[PDB]
Amino acid sequence: MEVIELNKCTSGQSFEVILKPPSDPSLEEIQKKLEAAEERRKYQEAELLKHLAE
Amino acid sequence: REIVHIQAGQCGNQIGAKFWEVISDEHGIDPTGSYHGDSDLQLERINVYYNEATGNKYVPRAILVDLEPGTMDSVRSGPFGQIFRPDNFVFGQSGAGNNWAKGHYTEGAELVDSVLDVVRKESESCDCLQGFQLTHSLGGGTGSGMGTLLISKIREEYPDRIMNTFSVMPSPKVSDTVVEPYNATLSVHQLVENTDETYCIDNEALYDICFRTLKLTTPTYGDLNHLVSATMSGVTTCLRFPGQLNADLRKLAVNMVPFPRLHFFMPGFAPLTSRGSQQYRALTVPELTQQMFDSKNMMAACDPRHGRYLTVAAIFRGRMSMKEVDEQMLNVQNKNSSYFVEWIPNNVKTAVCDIPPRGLKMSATFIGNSTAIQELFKRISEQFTAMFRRKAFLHWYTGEGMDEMEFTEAESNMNDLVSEYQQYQDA
Amino acid sequence: MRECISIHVGQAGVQIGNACWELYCLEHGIQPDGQMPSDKTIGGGDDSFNTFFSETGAGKHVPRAVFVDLEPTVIDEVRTGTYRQLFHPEQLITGKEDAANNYARGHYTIGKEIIDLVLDRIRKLADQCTGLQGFLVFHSFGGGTGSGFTSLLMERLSVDYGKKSKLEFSIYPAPQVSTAVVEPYNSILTTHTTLEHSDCAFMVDNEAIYDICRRNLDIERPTYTNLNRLISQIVSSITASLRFDGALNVDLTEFQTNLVPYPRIHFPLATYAPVISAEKAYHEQLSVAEITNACFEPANQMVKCDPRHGKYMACCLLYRGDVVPKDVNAAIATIKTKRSIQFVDWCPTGFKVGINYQPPTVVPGGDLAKVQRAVCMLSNTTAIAEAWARLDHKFDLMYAKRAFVHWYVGEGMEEGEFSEAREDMAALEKDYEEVGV
Amino acid sequence: MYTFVVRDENSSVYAEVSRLLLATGQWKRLRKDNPRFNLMLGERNRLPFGRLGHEPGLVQLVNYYRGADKLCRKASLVKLIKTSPELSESCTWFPESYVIYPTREVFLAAYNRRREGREGNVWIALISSEASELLDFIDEQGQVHVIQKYLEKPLLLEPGHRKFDIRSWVLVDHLYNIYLYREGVLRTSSEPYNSANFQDKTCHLTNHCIQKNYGRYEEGNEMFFEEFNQYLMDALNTTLENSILLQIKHIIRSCLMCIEPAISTKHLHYQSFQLFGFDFMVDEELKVWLIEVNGAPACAQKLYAELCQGIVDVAISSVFPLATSIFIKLHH
Ligand SMILES: Nc1nc2c(ncn2[C@@H]2O[C@H](COP(=O)(O)OP(=O)(O)OP(=O)(O)O)[C@@H](O)[C@H]2O)c(=O)[nH]1
Ligand SMILES: Nc1ncnc2c1ncn2[C@@H]1O[C@H](COP(=O)(O)OP(=O)(O)CP(=O)(O)O)[C@@H](O)[C@H]1O
Ligand SMILES: Nc1nc2c(ncn2[C@@H]2O[C@H](COP(=O)(O)OP(=O)(O)O)[C@@H](O)[C@H]2O)c(=O)[nH]1
Ligand SMILES: COc1ccc2c(c1)CCCN2c1nc(C)nc2onc(C)c12
Ligand SMILES: [Ca+2]
Ligand SMILES: [Mg+2]
Ligand SMILES: [Mg+2]
Ligand SMILES: [Mg+2]
């Protein structure tokens, strides 16, 4: 029912209509997690090369 | 994203040669390497399998390996023989005697480093090598023993690249020697560890397709390799032609292989054709879909109703209704839902390519990861054990330095593979 | 005037960026060489469209955009296509090999190799900004780059641009057009890692767009081109307030204030009408009432769900075309007496309405017909949580057998991040349930 | 072959429906959690409606209406009747009811004008004339339960001076057609009605299990319509259709037209039907009152066959066709 904050301009209008009232990680932490993943990839690869050397 | 192709041994090189013949025709490359096709789609991703040279010549990125020169002289004499890079022919003289051990430990060891030199020369040229495909049999000596030795060494030098094989499985119905179950069992153990993707091409299945379906009373290796080349063309379609998908070997592995060791695919093809026989009637999309899922169109002699599909890839080739392909593909899943594991949602994916293969207006190629593939490994396991319990024919192997333990281990690893497939069939 | 930088990540984001920027150009009268005759302030300006376009002394209007993909094929088509002259080469960033549909390959192994290059190219656009508002980030949930690289990009933007808003446009995975079996994994992983870093996210379920194309455009088998041109229209509706004179949603901060009263529940549902085929030779033009009513039919939503069985926390109507407040209020009063629209008790029951008089623009020889009036409704309803339920179920089915997990552990990810991401989704679903009943 | 899944192993009604489906030769039953189904006969508690209608190439149907629990819980049905202008509040076929919480003053207001008027002032959860024991009861229980004006002058069948309720079975299909099964059942007391002792349990509560005289006057304390209509003719010079069934049809049509906008699946990506049990009370002036609406009703053993076959005909085969109508369509 109540229209409010009606704003008009050349290219449009806006307004609000109410029907009833109511009733992060740091850079070092990221570069730490990215480097923990790389170590893990490196380890996994060393195991593969050790296995193929056997 | 370049692929380096290796073909090893008699079988490896015969199907390998037929592969380059078939795709060279699809891409419009003559036997001299000059392109005389008609559509830019044939060149858009020719980089995947061909190097360019002076005069804009296309040279297969292909390495030809054998421990005896016989079959490689035959390739050089063949129709497309003049297309391959001469330096990429790497052969010894002594042969391998259908002996895995000669391929892997003795004769093949003399020759392996020269093969790796050529592989390295081809890899070093690649803008961005995606990986390797190997063609070989598992029942002989060179492709089986030396092929898997190559795979081991390639992985050492290129550990972060994809290894893909087309591996022909021995069958008493198409048999050179009684030791094929030994050679296949020792190779399957290698394949389980050191490839991401192997197409299980089963000479039992190919023999049966030629006899029962194709009406070929006495099939030849030529009739079997016609089925193989049609399958190898189909399963590489998405690698060679531009599509919505723009597929590579690694995304294929990521989506087809839910568990590292279970990477043995069952390929299928429709419509099935014998050589020289031309089919004049088109298959409707419903017939392509029914036939391509038919047990009788499978290249691994396994009954898929005896297992369950982990993942499925289906590639359709030709001018056809994409809507009809979707409905028919969906229709297969809904009507047979029990045969697709419920714990991988939407595990059947579809690709379409406008270019049909030679001589067909429509075709379908099927790549299934079914737990029914265990049937193949159990069949080889039984044949292996029948000999091994009496230690029969083993001297051919202990005379090249192998020990019985290595056989015991190989058997055990393959039985483990079988029960692992069994584990997901009851899940 | 405050600038906004658009970042398009992976195939889905890049291709949708193409669609939107083509449309922005037609809407603002910018030619493909980047010239804009109607703009008389040569070399610069602080007009509303300069929110999305910088200016060169030679009159070129350059999108404040960066495209980033881990593989060159898709951005290579921007580099050669109709709008090639629009973008500076430094704005188009490609690697050599993609994430292979694998969140962990996009986030960790490959993402770590290219994050610094992307941030410096972004830094080069931010430096041209007198008052940067924040970022609009376009990507798929399911792609490995889309999911894995975006989440890393989002973590860093929070670090480098701490006080700037970040909006997402996120393509939710549908099996009819996806070809990756692992998209539930990627979706959960990226949603978990990004949630704290995103202020407001518009999810677009490809399943919803696909059926709208089938049903309303009579397209037997929609392509990415069909889907993206329709998506770009919705995106245009949402961003129009940043690019045009107006009083409603004028800065990114305003999207969060108007649509998101609780930080984690920041996925507004979008509904768009009318979608009419260009092939339709006879078409009766739909009224304000008809198209506002269409906003509460689930068949017009960007995600299929039933808002009748949730609760609203906020609701905006964005009209384009011949629309005046009288007709909107008349239409709203009728709808209220005929539909199930319950708000949470701690929010007023109401609509924030914006009207731009220029009717929607359509790509010549595209699929959408030109209409006399259109509307995009942005409502924050708990009903959208059905999409989390669907996704989480598919995730649980696969993870219970650890299917495909080895592909992620092999890029250096830990199995624990799967259950960490899934626990967060579980908490998300429970937040929506509390608010919703 | 169409496909269906079964997620309510206790449903007497759909146990039969799935046997009928299977014995058609054109329906295959799937494992519970297989998502590639045509028909879901679902769980009663937390049926995942949000997962329905997202399988391409499958029209999906479910035997429950999301939101219909507003009509099928006693607390919700009261709120729905007082707030919806389509019914409220001088809705004249529902007993004056009030919701009450344990951790009410409106209810005391009518109870006190009841006492000041010295009228019949007995209510029900469980029955009493003093609100204090109705409330001293409510809190030593631990749950929400409405209390309701107890009908002190109920129609009583003879011989027996006995009370009863009428259960009607109503099927609502995916088109929101409202189908009333032509067979109803009367669930009788076999104990004579006793105005002077409400603690005395059996003669007031007409529940088929809560009769444990059971069977004296007719098999299973169930009188079907042929006999009840005959009785109303010989006893009262009227028919069942005229004196009772018009009001039952009005109440059913009214209740279901009310929630139509909130539960209809007309434009939805998945479709619903649902079977309901309406429970009625008839007073000595032959006025029908709604007692209660039951969302997962059982049937009566005589009628299981006919009704379930009709659930297939109108609700399932209308959506998935195969390769003398037991319902009355209530028009709207
Ligand atoms: N709506 C829409 N969805 C797309 C588009 N392209 C891809 N998708 C969807 O996005 C998902 C796949 O993610 P992509 O963006 O293609 O993958 P990516 O981000 O490039 O990551 P990788 O290829 O894995 O390195 C699937 O669900 C597709 O259906 C597009 O252009 N429009
Ligand atoms: N206001 C009222 N006036 C008279 N009798 C009433 C009444 N409310 C309930 N009853 C009696 O109480 C019995 C049970 O009532 P309720 O209405 O609580 O259903 P139930 O949950 O007990 C089983 P169903 O769901 O099958 O009805 C009815 O059979 C009826 O005889
Ligand atoms: N399908 C097919 N199988 C073959 C071919 N040649 C050999 N085989 C099979 O491969 C096995 C023999 O191995 P082969 O390749 O000849 O031994 P190698 O030369 O040492 O590698 C046997 O099982 C044969 O049946 C062929 O051309 N096609
Ligand atoms: C079961 O989910 C699949 C199956 C396969 C694939 C994908 C997903 C994604 C892209 C790669 N990919 C494919 N890769 C190749 C070389 N050929 C193919 O043919 N069809 C498909 C599909 C396909
Ligand atoms: Ca200017
Ligand atoms: Mg041989
Ligand atoms: Mg990509
Ligand atoms: Mg009850």
Side-chain angles (χ1 to χ4, degrees), chain A, chain B residues 1-318 320-427, chain C residues 1-95 97-112 114-369 371-437, chain D residues 1-30 32-115 117-133 135-139 141-196 198-332:
Chain A
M1 312 207 194
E2 176 148 299
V3 169
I4 71 172
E5 300 213 72
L6 179 66
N7 261 285
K8 297 182 78 189
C9 72
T10 192
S11 52
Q13 345 179 203
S14 68
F15 63 91
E16 181 177 14
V17 61
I18 312 187
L19 314 184
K20 62 95 180 141
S23 309
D24 305 310
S26 58
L27 174 44
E28 91 168 325
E29 284 157 348
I30 287 174
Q31 274 214 24
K32 209 132 170 169
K33 105 164 179 290
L34 283 181
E35 278 173 4
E38 204 200 333
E39 53 154 53
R40 279 184 305 266
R41 263 192 325 275
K42 228 79 76 64
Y43 180 92
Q44 300 169 10
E45 195 190 69
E47 295 280 304
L48 174 65
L49 297 178
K50 272 166 203 56
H51 187 269
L52 299 174
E54 274 170 340
Chain B
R1 288 200 62 56
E2 298 84 18
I3 295 168
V4 167
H5 166 95
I6 306 182
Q7 53 192 58
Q10 191 176 7
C11 177
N13 273 274
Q14 266 152 17
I15 74 175
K18 281 283 298 159
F19 173 66
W20 291 104
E21 293 179 19
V22 171
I23 72 167
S24 296
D25 169 67
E26 309 197 346
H27 289 283
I29 312 301
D30 69 19
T32 60
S34 305
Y35 169 76
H36 276 105
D38 67 306
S39 151
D40 307 72
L41 271 38
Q42 314 172 282
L43 289 170
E44 190 156 0
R45 304 170 50 212
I46 200 134
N47 194 69
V48 173
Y49 281 105
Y50 294 84
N51 289 317
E52 218 156 319
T54 78
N56 295 101
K57 300 273 187 176
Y58 294 92
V59 174
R61 189 165 318 93
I63 301 163
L64 302 79
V65 177
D66 206 351
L67 281 163
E68 65 185 357
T71 306
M72 261 157 61
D73 292 8
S74 229
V75 170
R76 207 166 4 241
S77 298
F80 279 79
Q82 311 291 79
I83 204 205
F84 299 102
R85 189 180 305 279
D87 318 83
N88 294 15
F89 291 77
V90 181
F91 50 96
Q93 287 301 92
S94 310
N98 294 313
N99 188 334
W100 194 81
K102 294 174 169 254
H104 203 91
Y105 290 128
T106 59
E107 308 295 327
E110 281 189 56
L111 190 68
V112 77
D113 282 352
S114 353
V115 177
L116 296 175
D117 293 344
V118 176
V119 169
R120 193 171 314 114
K121 179 182 81 174
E122 292 282 359
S123 287
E124 285 180 337
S125 295
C126 292
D127 217 37
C128 190
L129 174 76
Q130 27 175 334
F132 305 98
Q133 64 178 42
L134 173 81
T135 52
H136 66 155
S137 67
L138 313 175
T142 295
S144 212
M146 187 182 188
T148 55
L149 178 74
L150 273 158
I151 290 167
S152 204
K153 304 215 138 101
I154 290 166
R155 185 170 188 199
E156 210 180 355
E157 174 155 28
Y158 307 89
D160 62 353
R161 298 306 200 325
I162 292 294
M163 175 65 64
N164 168 256
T165 71
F166 300 76
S167 302
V168 178
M169 318 273 176
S171 178
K173 312 215 223 195
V174 190
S175 180
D176 295 2
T177 58
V178 297
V179 283
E180 291 166 359
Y182 285 159
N183 300 335
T185 294
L186 300 156
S187 295
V188 165
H189 180 14
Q190 299 290 323
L191 294 186
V192 166
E193 284 199 8
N194 295 323
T195 75
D196 307 295
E197 280 158 350
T198 98
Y199 297 96
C200 294
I201 299 139
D202 185 356
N203 279 343
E204 179 123 1
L206 312 172
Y207 183 89
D208 288 335
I209 295 176
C210 289
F211 190 95
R212 314 175 159 154
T213 303
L214 285 194
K215 258 44 162 170
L216 299 178
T217 69
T218 50
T220 68
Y221 282 117
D223 298 308
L224 287 30
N225 298 336
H226 173 72
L227 295 181
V228 176
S229 63
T231 305
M232 302 183 69
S233 167
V235 307
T236 63
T237 291
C238 289
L239 308 171
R240 314 187 271 108
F241 290 99
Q244 223 64 349
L245 244 196
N246 93 136
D248 62 62
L249 291 168
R250 172 167 285 107
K251 301 201 214 98
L252 175 65
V254 172
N255 288 283
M256 293 290 296
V257 185
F259 302 102
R261 294 163 43 98
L262 314 175
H263 57 260
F264 293 88
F265 303 156
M266 178 182 310
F269 191 83
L272 291 161
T273 65
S274 58
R275 277 188 327 186
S277 261
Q278 171 152 211
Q279 70 150 213
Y280 305 120
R281 176 175 39 114
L283 273 77
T284 76
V285 173
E287 312 178 304
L288 268 188
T289 307
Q290 205 256 58
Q291 279 169 53
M292 97 186 296
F293 275 97
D294 200 320
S295 150
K296 300 159 29 213
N297 293 49
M298 301 293 161
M299 314 287 154
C302 309
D303 181 354
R305 291 186 180 265
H306 296 159
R308 301 229 269 160
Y309 284 119
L310 297 171
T311 54
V312 180
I315 157 77
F316 288 78
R317 289 257 247 154
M320 82 204 71
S321 178
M322 289 219 48
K323 185 210 179 355
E324 203 173 33
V325 170
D326 284 340
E327 307 185 317
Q328 294 301 318
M329 283 305 290
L330 291 173
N331 180 78
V332 159
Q333 286 160 104
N334 298 340
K335 287 172 177 179
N336 303 291
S337 52
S338 72
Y339 294 99
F340 301 84
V341 296
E342 79 279 12
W343 45 267
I344 303 179
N346 316 294
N347 60 344
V348 184
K349 301 284 168 187
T350 295
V352 275
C353 168
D354 287 356
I355 310 305
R358 176 143 283 255
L360 298 181
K361 39 88 214 62
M362 312 240 92
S363 76
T365 299
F366 170 96
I367 307 174
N369 192 349
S370 173
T371 68
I373 199 68
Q374 69 178 285
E375 280 182 355
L376 186 176
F377 299 119
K378 281 179 276 173
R379 195 240 301 150
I380 292 154
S381 207
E382 294 165 15
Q383 302 167 346
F384 176 107
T385 285
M387 294 190 289
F388 194 60
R389 66 176 159 185
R390 304 294 285 274
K391 298 159 271 299
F393 299 103
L394 218 64
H395 69 103
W396 296 121
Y397 301 82
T398 59
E400 314 287 325
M402 308 184 62
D403 183 72
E404 275 172 31
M405 271 283 164
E406 205 173 319
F407 280 70
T408 302
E409 286 166 33
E411 180 189 63
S412 231
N413 189 35
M414 191 177 309
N415 289 337
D416 287 344
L417 178 65
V418 169
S419 52
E420 185 176 352
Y421 272 120
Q422 187 56 34
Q423 167 189 351
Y424 296 112
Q425 183 172 313
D426 303 315
Chain C
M1 183 283 284
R2 315 234 303 151
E3 302 88 344
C4 296
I5 298 170
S6 287
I7 309 177
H8 313 269
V9 182
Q11 187 185 271
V14 166
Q15 282 183 338
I16 290 161
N18 280 326
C20 303
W21 285 100
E22 171 175 36
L23 186 63
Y24 296 160
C25 286
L26 296 166
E27 294 183 2
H28 297 288
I30 308 185
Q31 286 294 309
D33 57 14
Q35 299 277 314
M36 161 174 37
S38 68
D39 167 19
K40 312 298 182 202
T41 37
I42 305 272
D46 54 353
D47 294 318
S48 277
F49 58 84
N50 292 118
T51 292
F52 276 51
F53 295 87
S54 64
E55 286 175 67
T56 70
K60 190 196 252 186
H61 300 269
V62 185
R64 300 185 201 273
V66 41
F67 296 69
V68 50
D69 198 0
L70 293 177
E71 161 256 325
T73 280
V74 181
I75 277 164
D76 277 343
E77 286 193 74
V78 182
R79 282 163 181 147
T80 52
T82 308
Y83 288 95
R84 57 188 196 281
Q85 329 183 46
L86 208 57
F87 303 104
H88 189 294
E90 303 197 352
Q91 298 165 274
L92 308 177
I93 311 173
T94 57
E97 68 173 344
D98 71 24
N101 304 160
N102 179 341
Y103 172 97
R105 197 174 172 87
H107 189 85
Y108 294 93
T109 110
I110 294 183
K112 164 153 141 66
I114 209 178
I115 187 63
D116 289 342
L117 175 65
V118 167
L119 287 174
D120 290 352
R121 299 290 172 76
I122 293 171
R123 174 65 63 191
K124 284 197 174 18
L125 289 182
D127 281 353
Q128 298 164 32
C129 297
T130 65
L132 174 67
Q133 311 193 41
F135 309 89
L136 287 69
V137 186
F138 301 76
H139 66 99
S140 67
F141 278 182
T145 305
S147 70
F149 182 72
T150 294
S151 64
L152 175 64
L153 180 62
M154 295 290 279
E155 290 177 306
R156 291 284 295 266
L157 291 179
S158 286
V159 169
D160 287 17
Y161 305 90
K163 279 180 100 204
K164 326 301 170 303
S165 305
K166 304 188 267 316
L167 268 54
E168 295 179 89
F169 289 89
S170 288
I171 304 316
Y172 175 110
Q176 279 171 123
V177 286
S178 100
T179 76
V181 156
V182 292
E183 289 186 31
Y185 282 171
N186 297 337
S187 304
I188 290 329
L189 290 166
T190 203
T191 297
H192 165 49
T193 297
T194 300
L195 197 55
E196 292 303 299
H197 300 280
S198 181
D199 301 294
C200 182
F202 301 102
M203 279 195 279
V204 182
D205 187 338
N206 267 348
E207 179 201 62
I209 305 302
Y210 195 87
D211 281 332
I212 290 165
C213 285
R214 272 171 119 173
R215 240 186 289 115
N216 297 338
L217 296 175
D218 286 311
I219 301 170
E220 278 198 318
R221 205 258 192 254
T223 64
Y224 286 137
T225 305
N226 307 118
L227 301 189
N228 290 345
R229 283 198 288 237
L230 171 63
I231 297 182
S232 65
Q233 301 268 328
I234 279 72
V235 171
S236 181
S237 303
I238 294 165
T239 69
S241 44
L242 301 173
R243 307 182 276 111
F244 291 99
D245 202 355
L248 175 57
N249 300 335
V250 275
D251 70 28
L252 301 179
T253 272
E254 200 160 311
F255 284 82
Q256 158 193 264
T257 286
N258 286 353
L259 293 162
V260 186
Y262 291 107
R264 288 169 53 88
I265 304 188
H266 62 242
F267 304 80
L269 173 75
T271 314
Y272 188 83
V275 179
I276 296 298
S277 168
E279 296 328 303
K280 190 130 163 269
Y282 176 66
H283 175 61
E284 297 172 347
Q285 288 298 88
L286 296 167
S287 70
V288 162
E290 281 168 325
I291 66 168
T292 310
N293 200 34
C295 291
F296 299 88
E297 291 287 10
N300 298 326
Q301 317 176 340
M302 305 301 102
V303 183
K304 304 206 182 100
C305 57
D306 201 336
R308 300 177 290 177
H309 298 107
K311 290 184 178 183
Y312 288 90
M313 287 163 281
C315 190
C316 289
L317 298 159
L318 301 174
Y319 293 92
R320 285 171 94 161
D322 171 60
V323 177
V324 295
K326 183 181 55 193
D327 303 319
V328 179
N329 293 325
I332 288 169
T334 309
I335 290 154
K336 186 55 210 190
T337 70
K338 282 172 175 169
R339 292 212 187 251
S340 293
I341 303 154
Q342 291 211 86
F343 278 71
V344 301
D345 291 330
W346 49 266
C347 284
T349 287
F351 298 85
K352 276 185 173 70
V353 177
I355 304 185
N356 184 303
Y357 295 133
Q358 173 193 76
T361 308
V362 281
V363 168
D367 303 296
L368 289 207
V371 297
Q372 285 173 36
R373 60 196 64 83
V375 64
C376 173
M377 185 171 73
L378 302 183
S379 59
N380 188 7
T381 158
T382 62
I384 212 163
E386 294 174 30
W388 301 132
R390 286 173 39 216
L391 215 58
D392 284 336
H393 184 68
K394 287 171 177 186
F395 179 108
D396 293 336
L397 282 171
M398 297 184 70
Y399 190 74
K401 317 282 187 280
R402 301 300 185 273
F404 303 103
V405 171
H406 74 281
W407 289 112
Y408 297 67
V409 167
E411 306 284 9
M413 198 169 101
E414 295 173 70
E415 206 177 69
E417 174 166 356
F418 277 95
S419 49
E420 228 188 77
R422 182 67 180 85
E423 261 162 45
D424 201 8
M425 293 320 287
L428 192 68
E429 286 200 54
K430 220 201 76 55
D431 294 329
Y432 277 98
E433 214 199 316
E434 279 174 40
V435 178
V437 179
Chain D
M1 283 215 205
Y2 304 110
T3 56
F4 73 100
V5 300
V6 166
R7 302 164 65 90
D8 189 334
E9 302 265 51
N10 166 30
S11 168
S12 352
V13 159
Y14 292 104
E16 175 73 343
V17 164
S18 43
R19 298 185 295 244
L20 277 301
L21 297 184
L22 286 162
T24 201
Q26 310 194 227
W27 287 91
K28 198 160 207 180
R29 180 181 162 169
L30 311 174
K32 250 177 33 176
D33 304 338
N34 187 351
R36 314 200 87 106
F37 56 82
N38 278 123
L39 176 58
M40 171 176 278
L41 315 176
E43 57 224 271
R44 288 161 82 174
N45 310 134
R46 310 199 90 261
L47 183 169
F49 296 93
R51 299 211 303 258
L52 297 172
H54 300 283
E55 289 302 326
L58 284 177
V59 175
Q60 287 185 326
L61 177 62
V62 62
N63 66 343
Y64 278 99
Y65 262 97
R66 199 180 187 188
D69 52 270
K70 306 272 137 47
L71 211 82
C72 299
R73 302 307 184 276
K74 286 160 168 64
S76 313
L77 178 56
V78 173
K79 175 166 160 268
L80 185 77
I81 276 167
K82 282 176 170 183
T83 66
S84 308
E86 299 114 303
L87 315 166
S88 144
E89 194 292 321
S90 72
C91 165
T92 56
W93 42 263
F94 195 60
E96 185 182 283
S97 304
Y98 308 91
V99 188
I100 309 286
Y101 291 102
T103 293
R104 197 202 219 94
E105 200 147 35
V106 179
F107 159 50
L108 291 198
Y111 179 100
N112 277 313
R113 196 182 337 103
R114 219 97 194 159
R115 179 185 44 137
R118 273 149 308 125
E119 317 179 318
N121 189 341
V122 65
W123 302 71
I124 192 175
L126 324 169
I127 314 172
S128 170
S129 301
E130 294 107 313
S132 307
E133 305 286 65
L135 295 184
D136 280 11
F137 182 69
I138 281 187
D139 314 309
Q141 316 293 129
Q143 228 65 27
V144 159
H145 220 276
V146 45
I147 61 97
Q148 175 168 65
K149 183 49 186 48
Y150 186 75
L151 301 154
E152 303 182 27
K153 312 284 186 251
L155 184 78
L156 300 182
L157 324 165
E158 310 294 3
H161 219 63
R162 331 146 54 187
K163 179 184 192 164
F164 68 87
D165 61 64
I166 295 174
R167 159 68 74 67
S168 292
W169 289 282
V170 170
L171 178 59
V172 178
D173 70 7
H174 61 296
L175 303 186
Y176 222 83
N177 292 308
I178 296 158
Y179 295 102
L180 168 64
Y181 187 19
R182 78 190 162 197
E183 303 294 337
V185 69
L186 276 76
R187 297 176 299 189
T188 68
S189 183
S190 45
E191 279 49 72
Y193 181 77
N194 187 24
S195 299
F198 300 121
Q199 322 151 102
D200 181 291
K201 25 165 303 181
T202 326
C203 100
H204 289 282
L205 276 41
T206 51
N207 316 66
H208 196 291
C209 38
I210 284 59
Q211 310 262 309
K212 47 177 281 175
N213 280 16
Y214 171 89
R216 196 238 207 271
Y217 301 96
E218 64 272 327
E219 175 174 6
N221 269 13
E222 309 191 304
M223 185 200 296
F224 297 91
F225 278 4
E226 211 197 4
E227 187 197 329
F228 181 52
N229 179 69
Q230 188 60 243
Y231 167 87
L232 292 170
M233 297 201 292
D234 305 331
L236 293 179
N237 206 21
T238 196
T239 67
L240 170 58
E241 169 73 27
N242 280 10
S243 67
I244 291 154
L245 224 50
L246 279 178
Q247 296 167 76
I248 285 168
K249 297 193 286 200
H250 167 82
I251 298 179
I252 296 163
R253 200 186 284 120
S254 272
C255 288
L256 286 172
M257 289 326 291
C258 179
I259 58 185
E260 228 248 25
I263 75 168
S264 159
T265 68
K266 186 140 297 176
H267 298 304
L268 240 211
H269 39 294
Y270 84 75
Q271 297 245 263
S272 286
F273 70 93
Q274 188 170 346
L275 171 71
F276 298 87
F278 284 74
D279 297 338
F280 296 100
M281 193 72 231
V282 187
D283 66 38
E284 63 188 29
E285 321 215 276
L286 298 159
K287 180 194 186 161
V288 175
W289 311 78
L290 178 62
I291 292 308
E292 196 245 343
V293 190
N294 212 292
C299 193
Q301 207 267 335
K302 183 188 190 194
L303 312 165
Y304 266 113
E306 185 162 54
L307 170 70
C308 293
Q309 181 52 58
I311 286 161
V312 177
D313 296 349
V314 173
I316 301 179
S317 296
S318 66
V319 174
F320 312 97
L322 293 182
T324 58
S325 178
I326 57 140
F327 302 103
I328 317 153
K329 183 166 175 157
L330 312 179
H331 290 310
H332 48 77

